[PDB]
Amino acid sequence: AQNPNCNIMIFHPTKEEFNDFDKYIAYMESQGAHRAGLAKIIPPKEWKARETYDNISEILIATPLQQVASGRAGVFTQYHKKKKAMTVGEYRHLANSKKYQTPPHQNFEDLERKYWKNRIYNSPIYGADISGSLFDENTKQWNLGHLGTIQDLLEKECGVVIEGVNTPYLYFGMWKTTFAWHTEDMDLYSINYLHLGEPKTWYVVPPEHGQRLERLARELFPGSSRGCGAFLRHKVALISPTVLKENGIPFNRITQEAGEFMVTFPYGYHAGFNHGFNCAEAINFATPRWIDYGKMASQCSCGEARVTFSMDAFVRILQPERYDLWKRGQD
Ligand SMILES: O=C(O)CNC(=O)C(=O)O
Ligand SMILES: [Mg+2]
Ligand code: NI
Ligand SMILES: [Zn+2]
Secondary structure, three states, X not given: OOOOOOOOEEEOOOOOOOOOHHHHXXXXXXXXXXXXXXXXXXXXXXXXXXXXXXXXXXXXXXXXXXXXXXXXXXXXXXXXXXXXXXXXXXXXXXXXXXXXXXXXXXXXXXXXXXXXXXXXXXXXXXXXXXXOOOOOOOOOOXXXXXXXOHHHHHHHHHOOOOOXXXXXXXXXXXXXXXXXXXXXXXXXXXXXXXXXXXXXXXXXXXXXXXXXXXXXXXXXXXXXXXXXXXXXXXXXXXXXXXXXXXXXXXXXXXXXXXXXXEEEOOOOEEEEEEOOOXXXXXXXXXXXXXXXXHHHOOOOOOOOOOOOOOHHHHHHHHOHHHHHHHHHHHO
């Protein structure tokens, strides 16, 4: 079995190898990459996402989210308070202000220490989940707005024809902006490109051990667990590496820098934080190997997780027994 310790793998495709996206994903899995839950892909030196970022300040962040924490430094939840709209130029200036800017630090490890010590005492503002793309239309390789759609994958593998669409999302971050522990909708893959700015640190649990994380989360957030049998779908809970290690949960960590892709694999729980002002683009995708994960994915029906239009068909076709209850949660 390849990668039996479930380490995060880093890939350096050549420009030739960068042509066929599906083929390269399957290659990485042949080497055991999926066992980690997360892989890094460094693009060939000849590739670029777009010519310059010199013109992005006019993008609007219609609903910036202030991420307010509750709990203790290593075990907390965050709620999102909606803020007034602002442009990316306005948001960048805010990120760089004395109140929000990255503190002085020695290296990524020192910054990580500072994040886990102090995160809860601040409320950074995240421009998350903005439909759109920063890839040039002329970028033909690994262009996250030109991928094969999940609906087309389901049609090719299973024969069924369904409504729905599959588009990318932009994320504008600042110091301490946080993504809570989660798997993707329907335990899909994700791919994330860091277009510019400061790094993003990731934590990940191997898919084969995801239920260990779920059991810890039920212990650590016991009221949330009674409320919902899949409350990690709410995307609000944080658990630090120190707490994970104290509880014997297998995990790995890695830092993504501008110009790099990360892939999350089906049922790979992940969480992390931004180092400073940055912009990422991400989208969900599927392969043949996903279908069995989609059939088994948990679902929130309590009403909190509320998701896209396109998830309806996935539940309806892959999980017809659950459909009625899950749709009550949506309505
Ligand atoms: O970058 C972020 O805030 C969160 N991204 C992801 O969870 C992802 O790409 O799957
Ligand atoms: Mg602009
Ligand atoms: Ni994700
Ligand atoms: Zn729920």
